[PDB]
Amino acid sequence: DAIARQGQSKDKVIYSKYTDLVPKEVMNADDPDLQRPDEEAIKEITEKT
Amino acid sequence: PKPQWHPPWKLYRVISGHLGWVRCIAVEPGNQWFVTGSADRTIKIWDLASGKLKLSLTGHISTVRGVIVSTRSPYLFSCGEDKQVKCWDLEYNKVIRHYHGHLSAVYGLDLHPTIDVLVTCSRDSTARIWDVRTKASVHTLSGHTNAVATVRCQAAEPQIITGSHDTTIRLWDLVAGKTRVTLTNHKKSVRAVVLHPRHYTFASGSPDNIKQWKFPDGSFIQNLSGHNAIINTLTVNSDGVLVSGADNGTMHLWDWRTGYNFQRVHAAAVQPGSLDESGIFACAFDQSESRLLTAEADKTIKVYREDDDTATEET
Amino acid sequence: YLTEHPDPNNENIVGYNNKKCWPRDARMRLMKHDVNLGRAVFWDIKNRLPRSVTTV
Amino acid sequence: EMEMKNRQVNHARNIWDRAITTLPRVNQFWYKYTYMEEMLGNVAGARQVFERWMEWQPEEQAWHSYINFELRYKEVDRARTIYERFVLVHPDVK
Amino acid sequence: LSQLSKQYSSRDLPSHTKIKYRQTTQDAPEEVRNRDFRRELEERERAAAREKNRRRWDDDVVFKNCAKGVDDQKKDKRFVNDTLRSEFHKKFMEKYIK
Amino acid sequence: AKTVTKQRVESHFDLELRAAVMHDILDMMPEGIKQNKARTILQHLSEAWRCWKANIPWKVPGLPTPIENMILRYVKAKADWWTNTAHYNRERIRRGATVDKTVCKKNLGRL
Amino acid sequence: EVVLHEDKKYYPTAEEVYGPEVETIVQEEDTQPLTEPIIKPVK
């Protein structure tokens, strides 16, 4: 499965195994998962931008 | 189990009179006025508050394929089939500045919520990122084998995305002057893109199937299926329903958190005798989601409201 | 023609009106007999009144 | 196919694995995998082909033909368990 | 890159160097967050949709009244998708061809 | 540095019209064929040319009715591009100032 | 008793009678002037 990383490999690939074909369980209600990080993340990201 | 009691969505009002098919649609942040890009080469402005119009904008060399409303300044970003993407100043009743660098027609445009920049989906396949207020640009986004259908960006982690005709939805990380990831989920060209108010998962759609992907890290969300047709647009509202407009005229409302859509809407908006296959090219949800602006190739913008009924069936 | 004209009072330019260019200030402003002249134009229309023909 | 006709065939088989890591398309992956397994690497080619076919989606004619070729190869013992797993993945009357 | 900067051209001169922030008189983001615009638009459309309101010479003729009582047959305001004739190109071609 | 206006804006509108028509034409059939879609741009293109430009319906026997209806829709949109613009040309001729010969008598001949 | 010479009918009544409760609004005349382009009179 690591053969798909041949060539340039740094950070974002996120396709190797086929386990990502079907999603995980179903839609659920969670604050960190289903919404977003805190406002300080958008503030520091906006300042970095 | 189809929870959260999806309410039925119905019509509100009918509008017509445009000289050509409506390519794009946009609304003011305070719901004061509306605007629509049209095939007639003149930028349309319609104030819908009473069912009225707004103003007739002119000077676009070709049909406007997109428009945007800046929150900070009264300048509506303009994009059209003329390959000239020009943000317009409306303060003087005349434009702001004309952006440059697009090699071909601009299929889309977007505005960053925090930083000042101009995003564009250019049929050259080039998605233009522009440092804007300075008259500057920012960076050129490439890598799509075919033309970029859609563009989306946010002030969160580098979520940037451009829907591409090449069947691989593009993901750009702009912060580094870079990209993000290649999305192979869509089996065909994705002409639809949406950003849900949940903000956790980026939404997209294609005629083959609709692809919803939970981001930032490269994770996905779900595969929306059951509507087979060319997908003109996808719009996610705050109530949990996302209307999907099609070129065939079938708008399918979406229950999302339930795992499947909230409605299959088949209706005839057909104008007088000229009809052919023209469907609804674009649609927009209101601020309070009390109505839905319907822009169709028949030059009829029809808002959609509900009758406040119980209903709530299942399947 | 007044009974055939569906309005109690308001009368637009109707059939014949807006004579300006050459006698700009020497033309007529308006009169009740001018509305009677428009009703006379309707009396010329209905006076001819072909079923199917190209008319005035 | 042009690289397969060469006398090396090592870079052609490794290129076939590179196509397996590339878009499988469920056509050239099973067909090219059957060509490589038919060329050489019986136990290995059927192992990687069974792991790949058991990874992304099941099959019908490719799965039944793969279990038939793996059964007629040497023994049907492993092909019986593989047939029970493939049949259990997509049950049906056929 | 660190290259491809040599000469300039027109239309590239410094322009709009100072942007314009949203004034509190036009659009305030906090006022939009606290906005009543749902009920404000329901009441606006409630008012607008609430009130909308607004004799031998004659005998010697060989014919009689022919066209009478026909007015609304031609729609005053009609938006037609067909651009061939409709209302517009009917009078447009009528004035440009005779 | 494109879109020179004059008569060049129409060529970019026809090329861009044939651009999205190729993507939607490729999205019309779920599988179909690859090279078969390229030749359809000639039949639909010229069929719309002689279709709208002439009085012939340009009906193709055994045609892909969804693709012929989409190309007929967008073809009628192209006719509208030559309709309202021609109405503006007649307004720019009589009322407006005349420009040269070619464009003038051209649009007059289209009308 | 049949139709009109110059007027007659070409696909009429379709959009007007389509929606039973639908109200169509088409303004081809003015739709506000260019004096005030929805700006802020901060003068």
mmCIF file with all atom_site columns, C-alpha atoms in Angstrom, chain A:
data_model
loop_
_atom_site.group_PDB
_atom_site.id
_atom_site.type_symbol
_atom_site.label_atom_id
_atom_site.label_alt_id
_atom_site.label_comp_id
_atom_site.label_asym_id
_atom_site.label_entity_id
_atom_site.label_seq_id
_atom_site.pdbx_PDB_ins_code
_atom_site.Cartn_x
_atom_site.Cartn_y
_atom_site.Cartn_z
_atom_site.occupancy
_atom_site.B_iso_or_equiv
_atom_site.pdbx_formal_charge
_atom_site.auth_seq_id
_atom_site.auth_comp_id
_atom_site.auth_asym_id
_atom_site.auth_atom_id
_atom_site.pdbx_PDB_model_num
ATOM 1  C CA . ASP A 1 1  ? 0.000   0.000  0.000  1.00 0.00 ? 1  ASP A CA 1
ATOM 2  C CA . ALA A 1 2  ? 2.974   2.347  0.495  1.00 0.00 ? 2  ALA A CA 1
ATOM 3  C CA . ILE A 1 3  ? 3.824   2.116  -3.222 1.00 0.00 ? 3  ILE A CA 1
ATOM 4  C CA . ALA A 1 4  ? 1.272   4.860  -3.952 1.00 0.00 ? 4  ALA A CA 1
ATOM 5  C CA . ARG A 1 5  ? 3.582   7.304  -2.127 1.00 0.00 ? 5  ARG A CA 1
ATOM 6  C CA . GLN A 1 6  ? 6.315   6.963  -4.768 1.00 0.00 ? 6  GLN A CA 1
ATOM 7  C CA . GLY A 1 7  ? 7.652   10.227 -6.136 1.00 0.00 ? 7  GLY A CA 1
ATOM 8  C CA . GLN A 1 8  ? 7.017   13.458 -4.249 1.00 0.00 ? 8  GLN A CA 1
ATOM 9  C CA . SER A 1 9  ? 5.421   12.714 -0.868 1.00 0.00 ? 9  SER A CA 1
ATOM 10 C CA . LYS A 1 10 ? 5.107   15.407 1.790  1.00 0.00 ? 10 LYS A CA 1
ATOM 11 C CA . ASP A 1 11 ? 1.835   15.859 3.675  1.00 0.00 ? 11 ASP A CA 1
ATOM 12 C CA . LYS A 1 12 ? -1.546  15.612 1.944  1.00 0.00 ? 12 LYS A CA 1
ATOM 13 C CA . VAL A 1 13 ? -2.345  12.407 0.056  1.00 0.00 ? 13 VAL A CA 1
ATOM 14 C CA . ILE A 1 14 ? -5.042  10.702 2.147  1.00 0.00 ? 14 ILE A CA 1
ATOM 15 C CA . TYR A 1 15 ? -5.598  7.924  -0.384 1.00 0.00 ? 15 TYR A CA 1
ATOM 16 C CA . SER A 1 16 ? -3.864  4.592  0.161  1.00 0.00 ? 16 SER A CA 1
ATOM 17 C CA . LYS A 1 17 ? -6.270  1.977  1.511  1.00 0.00 ? 17 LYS A CA 1
ATOM 18 C CA . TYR A 1 18 ? -9.838  1.610  0.271  1.00 0.00 ? 18 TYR A CA 1
ATOM 19 C CA . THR A 1 19 ? -11.255 2.030  3.795  1.00 0.00 ? 19 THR A CA 1
ATOM 20 C CA . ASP A 1 20 ? -12.154 5.604  2.775  1.00 0.00 ? 20 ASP A CA 1
ATOM 21 C CA . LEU A 1 21 ? -14.635 4.322  0.159  1.00 0.00 ? 21 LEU A CA 1
ATOM 22 C CA . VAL A 1 22 ? -17.665 4.092  2.462  1.00 0.00 ? 22 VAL A CA 1
ATOM 23 C CA . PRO A 1 23 ? -17.914 6.780  5.186  1.00 0.00 ? 23 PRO A CA 1
ATOM 24 C CA . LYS A 1 24 ? -17.709 6.052  8.923  1.00 0.00 ? 24 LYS A CA 1
ATOM 25 C CA . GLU A 1 25 ? -21.082 5.419  10.624 1.00 0.00 ? 25 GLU A CA 1
ATOM 26 C CA . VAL A 1 26 ? -23.503 8.303  9.861  1.00 0.00 ? 26 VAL A CA 1
ATOM 27 C CA . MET A 1 27 ? -24.034 11.992 10.597 1.00 0.00 ? 27 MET A CA 1
ATOM 28 C CA . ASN A 1 28 ? -23.854 12.772 14.320 1.00 0.00 ? 28 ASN A CA 1
ATOM 29 C CA . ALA A 1 29 ? -24.037 15.871 16.516 1.00 0.00 ? 29 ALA A CA 1
ATOM 30 C CA . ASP A 1 30 ? -20.686 16.871 18.028 1.00 0.00 ? 30 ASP A CA 1
ATOM 31 C CA . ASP A 1 31 ? -19.317 20.331 18.798 1.00 0.00 ? 31 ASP A CA 1
ATOM 32 C CA . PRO A 1 32 ? -15.668 19.869 17.687 1.00 0.00 ? 32 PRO A CA 1
ATOM 33 C CA . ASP A 1 33 ? -16.406 17.420 14.866 1.00 0.00 ? 33 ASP A CA 1
ATOM 34 C CA . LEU A 1 34 ? -19.545 18.876 13.269 1.00 0.00 ? 34 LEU A CA 1
ATOM 35 C CA . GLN A 1 35 ? -18.900 22.609 13.666 1.00 0.00 ? 35 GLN A CA 1
ATOM 36 C CA . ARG A 1 36 ? -15.387 24.122 13.739 1.00 0.00 ? 36 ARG A CA 1
ATOM 37 C CA . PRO A 1 37 ? -12.443 24.993 16.013 1.00 0.00 ? 37 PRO A CA 1
ATOM 38 C CA . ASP A 1 38 ? -12.578 28.016 18.312 1.00 0.00 ? 38 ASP A CA 1
ATOM 39 C CA . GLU A 1 39 ? -12.473 31.656 17.231 1.00 0.00 ? 39 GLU A CA 1
ATOM 40 C CA . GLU A 1 40 ? -8.771  31.912 18.101 1.00 0.00 ? 40 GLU A CA 1
ATOM 41 C CA . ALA A 1 41 ? -8.045  29.502 15.243 1.00 0.00 ? 41 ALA A CA 1
ATOM 42 C CA . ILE A 1 42 ? -9.741  31.789 12.715 1.00 0.00 ? 42 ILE A CA 1
ATOM 43 C CA . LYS A 1 43 ? -8.067  34.802 14.337 1.00 0.00 ? 43 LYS A CA 1
ATOM 44 C CA . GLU A 1 44 ? -4.556  33.339 14.177 1.00 0.00 ? 44 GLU A CA 1
ATOM 45 C CA . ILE A 1 45 ? -5.255  31.933 10.706 1.00 0.00 ? 45 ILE A CA 1
ATOM 46 C CA . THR A 1 46 ? -6.506  35.331 9.530  1.00 0.00 ? 46 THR A CA 1
ATOM 47 C CA . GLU A 1 47 ? -3.454  37.054 11.021 1.00 0.00 ? 47 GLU A CA 1
ATOM 48 C CA . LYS A 1 48 ? -1.158  34.496 9.381  1.00 0.00 ? 48 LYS A CA 1
ATOM 49 C CA . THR A 1 49 ? -2.952  35.100 6.080  1.00 0.00 ? 49 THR A CA 1
#
